[PDB]
Amino acid sequence: GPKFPRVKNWELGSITYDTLCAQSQQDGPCTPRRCLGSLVLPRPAEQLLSQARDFINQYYSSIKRSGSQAHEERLQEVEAEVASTGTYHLRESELVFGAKQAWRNAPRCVGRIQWGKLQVFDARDCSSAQEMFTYICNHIKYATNRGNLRSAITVFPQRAPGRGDFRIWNSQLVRYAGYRQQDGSVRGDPANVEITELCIQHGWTPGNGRFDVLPLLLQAPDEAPELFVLPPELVLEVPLEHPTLEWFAALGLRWYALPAVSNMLLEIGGLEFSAAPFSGWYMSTEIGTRNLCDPHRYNILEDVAVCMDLDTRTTSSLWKDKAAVEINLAVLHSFQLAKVTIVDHHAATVSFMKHLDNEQKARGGCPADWAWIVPPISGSLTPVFHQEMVNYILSPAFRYQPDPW
Amino acid sequence: KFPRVKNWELGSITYDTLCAQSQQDGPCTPRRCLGSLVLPRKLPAEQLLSQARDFINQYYSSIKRSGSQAHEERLQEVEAEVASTGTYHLRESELVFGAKQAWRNAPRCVGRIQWGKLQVFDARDCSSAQEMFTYICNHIKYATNRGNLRSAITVFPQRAPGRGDFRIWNSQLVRYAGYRQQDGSVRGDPANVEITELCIQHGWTPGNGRFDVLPLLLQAPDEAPELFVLPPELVLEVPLEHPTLEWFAALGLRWYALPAVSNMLLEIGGLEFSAAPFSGWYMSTEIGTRNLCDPHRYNILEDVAVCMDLDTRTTSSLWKDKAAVEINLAVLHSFQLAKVTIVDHHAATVSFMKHLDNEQKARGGCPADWAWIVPPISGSLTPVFHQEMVNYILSPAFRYQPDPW
Ligand code: HEM
Ligand code: HEM
Ligand SMILES: Fc1cccc(CCNCCc2ccnc(-n3ccnc3)n2)c1
Ligand SMILES: Fc1cccc(CCNCCc2ccnc(-n3ccnc3)n2)c1
Ligand SMILES: C[C@H](O)[C@H](O)[C@H]1CNc2nc(N)[nH]c(=O)c2N1
Ligand SMILES: C[C@H](O)[C@H](O)[C@H]1CNc2nc(N)[nH]c(=O)c2N1
Ligand SMILES: [Zn+2]
């Protein structure tokens, strides 16, 4: 057969080959000796120019002007700029393409069917932390759009030689506080203890609830971060209830509408955008299973199961399985009622199978991380479970980056 | 570098150093990860000799006599036998140790806490299909044990340069027939259509139920395969009911007690055993979720859901998730009622974490395949979801091999 990974779908019996992987220039963590595919983190002039060149070619290819005068002129322009400044700058429509291409390239995102329909806010003029705040507020208002959510990303200035970075300290634009107690436990979200304690250290007067929205710690170059409270009206939340278990509302659970990742680095043609928050809309298991039920997050599974009156003293009653299902139903139902966009794991994964089909035709494959694409309840009930996937790093890219503290 | 392996629920950290002992490539490279592929693409005197020496070293070291008379003397026997014949033979105790270590090394098996408790039947003195069937019926009898199941492996004669293999054509010892209908559909288990047809073409008179136990096709070397019907009393089945849903039993569903894999190759010290069926006991999700609910298997989700009276018209009612839970519950209830050994996915994964811990102390690691260890429902509800895992191949090993036709 072809000298390319063969990829099989075990439900349908169908076969493809991934030719796209040939274009990866960046090693992941696996070797022939051992697979490290389940780990979460995978821890200069000539280097830059070759990455810049690569990207500019991708751009010209995407507008069908590869080999052209305009193309060879853009390349010259970029070697000359690097020649005398050590860096270069992207045209506007280049950044729009890079950003969409980084999303499209993200192996862990199941929402990629929407990749072409992404609003890109250029914020590369931003010169202060106050100005970040405004740009961020504007993003939240656009993206939230009173519950009818819209994909977006706001791109702050790139890293620059010698000068410090623009950074958002928060991992999301909207996260709930985590308060370490005298008895060792935690009130709120245990995932957020450190950022909470940093916000206090920097002068935030802390609340004491389970669902206190955190302030933003925003940092402009070579400056201490500054603290900004989001105005409550901008932060859409949804109270949780259940369609038939009338008591479920009594639990006082709630989640926010807008999932916005704010500590990832966006890399395009070697340029590094250290602050570039993006947002989409939730898939229901992000909230109902991971956020609410992880042992190390809100961990509410026993609580709900006791209210449902299940036998929590024995694994084989499947009490965890039942309660998680009903928590997920409540998330779905409560967002529908409140007219806030959300997608269930069945719909989401169907749409991702379609994306895979599209990309197979458009590019000869799709980098995908199986363990993240498959949801954390009802795995094999979704079609992605039965699809082999090939995982690799393409550029443009979103990458993790070390916390700034 | 030895990889760092984090558990994300507890914050703990290990380093796998056991992977340094892998002598066998898997499918990944640093350019792309193929960890989600089910099969390898794939489907010498100095070499056999060094694999042999290594295995013998493992054995003598296992029983603590590394260096003794008997150790050096046994290495020479092996050297003398390969030099003269191109092969060698294992002593029975060596075989017992190799089979146990093959199970222990299997990265996809969640049952490995049990690895030391394995009954090994030595069937290397077997010269016909007839004899294989007798050995098979004794394996089934022992392993079944009137429902008090017990781990077992029966080992038929090794592969030999001169000649065809001993093979069990069936992929498991007990399996339900899949009969293709003129109008494309399938009565019984669609996974077994092909082997159902081969049984018919080598003589078997077929039935017409959804749960017809298949005969075995057993092949002695260079001979047409031969057909043997299992005595119905050797094959213990469990009818399926639900603890509270009265109608569930009248669906007619059932399943067999003994999960016995009959098509994998067992490799020890470079020697290869093409027929070496093994069995343990079921993890309930193997039956409730995959066997009964996969779209390409019995595919009963819709049926159950309508009986439960759920809204099938939309995914966001989570009817599939609800039905799947009740089916897995029926399976555990029904096996508990019939006094047949079963383990649920919660108890199983808990015991696998314990096993990881024993193996970190004993060997400095444990090869595991995260996509296989994490169950098909309620993934993140189980501790293995949160646990990073390193996958690699150690010998002795179970391997896949071609269907012999
Ligand atoms: C449009 C709706 C979207 C949906 C439903 C969606 C869904 C998801 C989901 C379920 C994950 C898994 C992350 C987790 O559970 O922790 C994910 C990861 C990701 N998504 Fe999206 N996404 C969407 C939009 C976007 C957009 C607009 C971007 C970028 C512009 C994006 C980039 C990513 C990236 C980079 C990851 C990986 C994050 C990580 O590794 O921690 N997604 N997405
Ligand atoms: C004693 C109870 C046992 C349990 C609960 C158990 C459980 C499992 C499970 C859940 C899997 C994944 C299989 C699937 O559904 O696809 C598996 C795979 C496997 N188990 Fe076990 N197992 C047991 C005993 C054994 C024994 C005795 C052996 C060998 C002698 C063994 C060897 C394997 C191997 C080689 C695989 C990989 C099969 C493949 O790749 O298709 N297991 N086991
Ligand atoms: F504790 C950790 C250390 C490193 C990475 C990690 C995973 C973070 N994953 C972010 C998931 C996330 C959150 C909000 N919003 C999105 N999102 C938005 C659009 N597409 C995805 N994704 C955890
Ligand atoms: F269609 C396929 C092509 C290649 C591999 C495949 C997976 C089969 N995997 C074994 C499943 C299985 C069945 C019964 N019993 C066990 N078993 C017994 C002890 N441990 C596991 N395992 C399917
Ligand atoms: C250890 C394992 O890699 C880790 O727990 C992964 C598994 N799959 C995931 N999948 C998604 N979508 N998000 C995650 O955070 C994780 N966590
Ligand atoms: C494509 C994917 O690798 C395949 O469906 C795997 C996923 N994980 C699995 N895990 C187990 N335990 N058994 C399986 O058959 C599978 N199938
Ligand atoms: Zn890999």
PDB file of C-alpha atoms and ligand atoms in Angstrom, chain A residues 8 10, chain B residues 38-39 103 108-111 151-152 171-175 191 255-256 258-264 278-283 286 290-291 296 372 400-401 403, ligand 4:
ATOM      1  CA  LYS A   8      -9.150   2.577  10.108  1.00  0.00           C
ATOM      2  CA  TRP A  10     -13.869  -0.043  13.005  1.00  0.00           C
TER       3      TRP A  10
ATOM      4  CA  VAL B  38      -5.635  -1.414  16.997  1.00  0.00           C
ATOM      5  CA  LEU B  39      -3.278  -3.492  14.734  1.00  0.00           C
ATOM      6  CA  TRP B 103       0.215 -11.704  30.765  1.00  0.00           C
ATOM      7  CA  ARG B 108      -4.007  -3.634  27.067  1.00  0.00           C
ATOM      8  CA  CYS B 109      -5.082  -5.966  29.922  1.00  0.00           C
ATOM      9  CA  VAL B 110      -6.785  -4.379  32.948  1.00  0.00           C
ATOM     10  CA  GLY B 111      -6.799  -7.726  34.780  1.00  0.00           C
ATOM     11  CA  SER B 151      -7.524 -17.887  35.016  1.00  0.00           C
ATOM     12  CA  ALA B 152      -5.994 -20.375  32.547  1.00  0.00           C
ATOM     13  CA  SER B 171     -10.893 -15.778  17.705  1.00  0.00           C
ATOM     14  CA  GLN B 172     -12.431 -16.935  21.006  1.00  0.00           C
ATOM     15  CA  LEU B 173     -13.359 -20.366  22.266  1.00  0.00           C
ATOM     16  CA  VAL B 174     -17.002 -19.322  22.849  1.00  0.00           C
ATOM     17  CA  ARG B 175     -18.619 -16.900  20.390  1.00  0.00           C
ATOM     18  CA  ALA B 191     -18.496  -9.653  14.317  1.00  0.00           C
ATOM     19  CA  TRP B 255     -24.112 -14.035  27.341  1.00  0.00           C
ATOM     20  CA  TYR B 256     -21.393 -16.616  27.970  1.00  0.00           C
ATOM     21  CA  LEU B 258     -15.895 -17.548  29.745  1.00  0.00           C
ATOM     22  CA  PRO B 259     -13.865 -14.905  27.947  1.00  0.00           C
ATOM     23  CA  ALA B 260     -11.222 -17.019  26.146  1.00  0.00           C
ATOM     24  CA  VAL B 261      -8.978 -15.547  23.430  1.00  0.00           C
ATOM     25  CA  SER B 262      -7.886 -18.248  20.990  1.00  0.00           C
ATOM     26  CA  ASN B 263      -6.140 -16.441  18.076  1.00  0.00           C
ATOM     27  CA  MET B 264      -3.136 -14.653  19.621  1.00  0.00           C
ATOM     28  CA  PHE B 278      -6.121 -18.036  27.404  1.00  0.00           C
ATOM     29  CA  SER B 279      -9.040 -17.053  29.601  1.00  0.00           C
ATOM     30  CA  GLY B 280      -9.890 -15.041  32.702  1.00  0.00           C
ATOM     31  CA  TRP B 281     -13.202 -13.496  33.597  1.00  0.00           C
ATOM     32  CA  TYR B 282     -15.197 -10.657  32.155  1.00  0.00           C
ATOM     33  CA  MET B 283     -15.163  -7.004  33.037  1.00  0.00           C
ATOM     34  CA  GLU B 286     -16.748  -5.684  27.699  1.00  0.00           C
ATOM     35  CA  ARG B 290     -19.111  -3.047  23.594  1.00  0.00           C
ATOM     36  CA  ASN B 291     -20.694  -6.477  22.824  1.00  0.00           C
ATOM     37  CA  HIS B 296     -21.447  -2.956  14.551  1.00  0.00           C
ATOM     38  CA  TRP B 372      -7.611   0.217  26.269  1.00  0.00           C
ATOM     39  CA  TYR B 400      -1.574 -10.607  17.038  1.00  0.00           C
ATOM     40  CA  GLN B 401      -1.284 -12.862  14.008  1.00  0.00           C
ATOM     41  CA  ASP B 403      -6.163 -15.180  10.178  1.00  0.00           C
TER      42      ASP B 403
HETATM   43  F1  LIG C   4     -11.789  -7.145  15.275  1.00  0.00           F
HETATM   44  C1  LIG C   4     -10.614  -7.151  15.937  1.00  0.00           C
HETATM   45  C2  LIG C   4      -9.386  -7.195  15.282  1.00  0.00           C
HETATM   46  C3  LIG C   4      -8.225  -7.187  16.046  1.00  0.00           C
HETATM   47  C4  LIG C   4      -8.304  -7.150  17.449  1.00  0.00           C
HETATM   48  C5  LIG C   4      -9.546  -7.118  18.098  1.00  0.00           C
HETATM   49  C6  LIG C   4      -9.703  -7.052  19.609  1.00  0.00           C
HETATM   50  C7  LIG C   4      -9.982  -8.380  20.326  1.00  0.00           C
HETATM   51  N1  LIG C   4      -9.452  -8.189  21.689  1.00  0.00           N
HETATM   52  C8  LIG C   4      -9.709  -9.290  22.639  1.00  0.00           C
HETATM   53  C9  LIG C   4     -11.081  -9.190  23.286  1.00  0.00           C
HETATM   54  C10 LIG C   4     -11.261 -10.245  24.336  1.00  0.00           C
HETATM   55  C11 LIG C   4     -12.289 -11.149  24.221  1.00  0.00           C
HETATM   56  C12 LIG C   4     -12.445 -12.139  25.196  1.00  0.00           C
HETATM   57  N2  LIG C   4     -11.612 -12.172  26.229  1.00  0.00           N
HETATM   58  C13 LIG C   4     -10.617 -11.274  26.365  1.00  0.00           C
HETATM   59  N3  LIG C   4      -9.780 -11.349  27.431  1.00  0.00           N
HETATM   60  C14 LIG C   4      -9.640 -12.419  28.211  1.00  0.00           C
HETATM   61  C15 LIG C   4      -8.696 -12.056  29.147  1.00  0.00           C
HETATM   62  N4  LIG C   4      -8.325 -10.781  28.868  1.00  0.00           N
HETATM   63  C16 LIG C   4      -9.001 -10.342  27.804  1.00  0.00           C
HETATM   64  N5  LIG C   4     -10.449 -10.321  25.417  1.00  0.00           N
HETATM   65  C17 LIG C   4     -10.687  -7.096  17.330  1.00  0.00           C
END
